[PDB]
């Protein structure tokens, strides 16, 4: 049940149903808790129209949710849909599009998007406005579906970047470690944090682009874990060259040296420059499930 967490972060209510604003949604993705209890404002059908008219001025790029802030509405169905998208590699976007386009005319119509709500059940919202207009006039083609999902992932990574860099232009290596371990509360966490405090040099700080590349790598964990298991079955220790080639096979791309160095300082638990890759994968899975 993610429904308890949805209603904990929801700041809006209407006719027994709870809703997030885009601000609510962003916070539920970055944080486990509130930090303050959120006040639930009841909505009339007149608050809703008011809260929906205005999607004109938010940005059609990677600041869409941050521009809207409290001026929008996201249903439980839509919250679950957005959460699944955040975990997908880019190759999963077309699959998600085609799953929803059940008549196969290469466009998603409001009626097809409504299937998600019918799954949940077995009224107008920010996403339905953005995708279909107020009466379902508009139809959503793949290229604006794909761009929205790319921009959703980009927006979370930019917001988390500044959250953990505390506003500075670059992420210190230990700021990246704080992001990486933020959802990790397991029995070995004291060892990770000891390594952060004592082995993370004040070396080359991490750029937004380098951070984005790591976040993209976390969506290819399935192939990465298979590669890790094949090294283990081969009795080959995962040193930096092994890690690099598994990253490239799972990904097609490289990770930057400051990030590779941070991963190994945190998760080289034996002191022989081999990665405790099972523990690393565990923390990565903590991240993905948020």
């Amino acid at each position: 049940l993610r429904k308890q967490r949805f209603m904990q972060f929801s700041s809006l209510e209407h006719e027994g149903e709870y809703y997030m604003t885009p601000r609510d949604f962003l916070f539920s993705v970055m944080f486990e808790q509130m930090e303050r209890k959120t006040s639930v404002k009841k909505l009339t059908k007149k608050d809703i129209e008011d809260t929906l008219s205005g999607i004109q001025t938010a940005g059609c790029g990677s600041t869409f949710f941050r521009d809207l802030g409290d001026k929008g509405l996201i249903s439980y169905t839509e919250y679950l849909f957005l959460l699944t998208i955040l975990t997908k590699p880019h190759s999963g976007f077309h699959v998600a599009f085609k799953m929803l386009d059940t008549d196969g005319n290469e466009m998603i119509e409001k009626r097809e998007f409504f299937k998600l709500q019918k799954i949940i059940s077995k009224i107008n919202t920010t996403l339905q406005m953005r995708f279909f207009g107020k009466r379902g006039q508009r139809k959503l083609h793949y290229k604006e579906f794909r761009r929205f999902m790319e921009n959703l992932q980009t927006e979370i990574q930019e917001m988390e970047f500044l959250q953990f860099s505390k506003g500075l232009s670059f992420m210190r290596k230990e700021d990246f470690a704080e992001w990486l371990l933020f959802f990790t509360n397991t029995e070995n966490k004291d060892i990770y944090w000891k390594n952060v405090r004592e082995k993370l040099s004040a070396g080359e700080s991490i750029s937004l682009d380098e951070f984005k590349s790591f976040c993209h790598f976390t969506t290819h964990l399935e192939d990465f874990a298979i590669a890790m298991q094949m090294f283990s079955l081969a009795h080959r220790p995962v040193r930096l060259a092994e890690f690099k080639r598994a990253v490239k096979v799972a990904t097609g791309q490289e990770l930057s040296n400051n990030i590779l160095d941070t991963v190994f300082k945190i998760f080289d638990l034996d002191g022989d420059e081999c990665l405790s890759h099972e523990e690393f994968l565990g923390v990565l899975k903590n991240r993905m499930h948020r």
Binding site: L1, G92, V95, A96, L116, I226, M230, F231, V249
Partner: protein
């Protein structure tokens, strides 16, 4: 009773014993020591529960066979002629073929790219044996076929996956034919047996479901090979199907027929007929609620 003992051999004995039980030929060419071989029929029998071994060809009992043309055992074009001129399957080839049959395409892709020289997915013979060995632990004519007469060439993933698909096709076709199809169709119950066998499940209750399938489809139009092959192509894609169902997992929703068709066409790129899906649901919907929980189907096929 015999069939049940044989099924235990299939499910629990070593490959050595399986091969010695189901292989039917011992070919001698003295001074050359004899070697035991499966025919393609024997190989398919060894992976097909409830198929009786010929009564005098049980454990360590074989039919004896001693420029000149040699007798052949596979139909024109068969994948089994990649193993040599007669279509016969040695023990080592039996190990290899069972690995290829069951390994997901993605694991071969990763393995080729992880253990080769440059990460292109092109292995030489020693790297290909590393891949085989690793892929196995996860769970001569042909070496020349893959790597050239001198054994110096390399094997691309693209060519090896064509081999895998050809092998999977020819084995499924042979299994389909062994159910003796009438006018190109096998029965709902026979299809059901193939699904259970594939799942590797040992369950009296599922077996009860499969034999009941005759009662449910009094109708009895049977399943064409394209219907069967499409569903097995769906099964081969089960991990990516499960990933594509992410929203349904978050919702706690089970899998209905219309969703199974949509994800099959979207992810596995096949059309599943209404009739093949009805047979699948009638087989695995054990609690009879009209839809398939993760426990009743996806999990079984993934964890097979």
């Amino acid at each position: 009773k015999v069939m049940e003992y044989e099924n235990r051999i299939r499910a629990y004995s070593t490959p050595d014993k399986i091969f010695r039980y189901f292989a039917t030929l011992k070919v001698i060419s003295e001074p050359g020591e004899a070697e035991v071989f499966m025919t393609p029929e024997d190989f398919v029998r060894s992976i097909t529960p409830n198929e009786k071994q010929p009564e005098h060809l049980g454990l360590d009992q074989y039919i004896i066979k001693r420029s000149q043309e040699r007798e052949k055992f596979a139909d024109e074009g068969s994948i089994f002629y990649t193993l040599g001129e007669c279509g016969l399957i040695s023990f080592s080839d039996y190990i290899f073929l069972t690995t290829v049959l069951s390994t997901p395409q993605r694991n071969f892709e990763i393995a080729f790219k992880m253990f080769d020289l440059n990460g292109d997915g092109e292995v030489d013979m020693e790297e290909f044996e590393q891949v085989q060995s690793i892929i196995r632990s996860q769970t001569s004519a042909l070496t020349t076929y893959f790597f050239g007469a001198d054994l110096k060439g390399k094997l691309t993933i693209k060519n090896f996956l064509e081999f895998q698909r050809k092998l999977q096709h020819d084995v499924l076709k042979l299994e389909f034919e062994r159910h003796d199809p009438v006018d190109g169709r096998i029965t709902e119950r026979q299809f059901g047996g193939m699904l259970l066998a594939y799942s590797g499940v040992q369950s009296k209750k599922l077996t009860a479901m499969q034999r009941q399938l005759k009662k449910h489809f009094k109708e009895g139009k049977g399943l064409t090979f394209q219907e069967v092959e499409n569903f097995f192509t769906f099964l081969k894609n089960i991990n990516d199907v499960d990933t594509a169902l992410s929203f349904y997992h978050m919702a706690g929703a089970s899998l209905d027929k219309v969703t199974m068709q949509q994800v099959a066409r979207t992810v596995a790129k096949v059309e599943l007929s209404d009739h093949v899906c009805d047979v699948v649901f009638a087989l695995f919907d054990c609690d009879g609620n009209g839809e398939l929980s993760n426990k009743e189907f996806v999990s079984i096929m993934k964890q097979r």
